[PDB]
Design a protein around this ligand. Sequence first.
Ligand SMILES: O[C@@H]1[C@@H](O)[C@H](O[C@@H]2CO[C@@H](O[C@@H]3CO[C@@H](O[C@@H]4CO[C@@H](O)[C@H](O)[C@H]4O)[C@H](O)[C@H]3O)[C@H](O)[C@H]2O)OC[C@H]1O
Ligand SMILES: [Cl-]
Ligand SMILES: [Zn+2]
Ligand SMILES: [Zn+2]
Ligand SMILES: [Zn+2]
Ligand SMILES: [Zn+2]
Ligand SMILES: [Zn+2]
Length: 371
Amino acid sequence: KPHISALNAPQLDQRYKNEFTIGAAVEPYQLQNEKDVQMLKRHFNSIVAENVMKPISIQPEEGKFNFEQADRIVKFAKANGMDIRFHTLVWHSQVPQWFFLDKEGKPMVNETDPVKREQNKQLLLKRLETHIKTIVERYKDDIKYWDVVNQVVGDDGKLRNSPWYQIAGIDYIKVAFQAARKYGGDNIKLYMNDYNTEVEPKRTALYNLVKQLKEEGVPIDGIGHQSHIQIGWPSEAEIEKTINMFAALGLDNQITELDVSMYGWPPRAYPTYDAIPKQKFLDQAARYDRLFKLYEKLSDKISNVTFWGIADNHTWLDSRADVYYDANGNVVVDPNAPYAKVEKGKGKDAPFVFGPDYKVKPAYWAIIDHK
Ligand SMILES: O[C@@H]1[C@@H](O)[C@H](O[C@@H]2CO[C@@H](O[C@@H]3CO[C@@H](O[C@@H]4CO[C@@H](O)[C@H](O)[C@H]4O)[C@H](O)[C@H]3O)[C@H](O)[C@H]2O)OC[C@H]1O
Ligand SMILES: [Cl-]
Ligand SMILES: [Zn+2]
Ligand SMILES: [Zn+2]
Ligand SMILES: [Zn+2]
Ligand SMILES: [Zn+2]
Ligand SMILES: [Zn+2]
């Protein structure tokens, strides 16, 4: 099956339209390239901001709101009949420091006096509420799906000990969801989003957290499985089990940031796309074949599958593609093998079904067929 141009290959959203929407994460510069725009028009019916809807891009100083970049994404989505997801209202990263400073400009995490801690909790929760209110009041009629909180459970199975948590305890999660519902109404859908949702003890910790909150009347409609995964790991059986476990609680599932790295963890990457050997693309394509067969089987539990980019010329995975060089200056990709130095983030990953020159990959054929 040929490496033809994606711009006029059979539409990916159309193959899957009774199953689930098919989305892409974007940057605003992509809305001004002809190729990106035509790929979004051709192949996708859902969109998400890769960066410009994060807390620090929206409210970088208290009272200063930048919606110019977000607005452009919203406008392109509406003009082209796409669903929109909001990524994301609360995170422990790409968050502005001003949130966690007390009245005299000192870090709140440092405060020892207990009545002064409770004042900070309330102040931070008030700020959290205002940030959410302003965003939801603006977008509630345009944006149907919302990452309310991101990564709030650590990998050790305990609540992640972010400043949000150190300062305000578990109430920050509750206030985030309650605030989105109050200002957005009943028709927006509210998600908790995380990675390694398939992995113990995080999976069960995630599960117990959401069940508890739902029991307490905290509004949560679903789980966002980021799905930054590899060719082998995690297995499909464990994905399937994960999806089913959350669906048992009456939660929707979205696959919110799908990419299939060519590498392991910590990754040892090739320095260029051209160096990646052909067999890696065939392996990837069988992984995607199994993957999307599983998504289809569970289509009644999954409303959306979104890829964390458009085509292989641009992916955040390249920021993790460390290249390992042995003493002779040759590239080392075997995980236990000798090496002398590493150039962090200088290599090239290849995670999507569309290549860097916008032609279809074997993984595409594997997910467009009905075999
Ligand atoms: O077991 C391994 C994990 O440790 C490992 O780590 C995490 C993967 O998920 C990440 O969170 C996602 C990452 O993408 C964010 O957007 C990017 C943030 O920075 C920008 O510069 C870039 O353009 C964005 O695309 C997204 O918002 C966020 O929700 C997390 O940070 C990693 O530690 O994954 C692999 C496992 O094997
Ligand atoms: Cl479309
Ligand atoms: Zn369409
Ligand atoms: Zn090339
Ligand atoms: Zn569905
Ligand atoms: Zn990017
Ligand atoms: Zn297939």
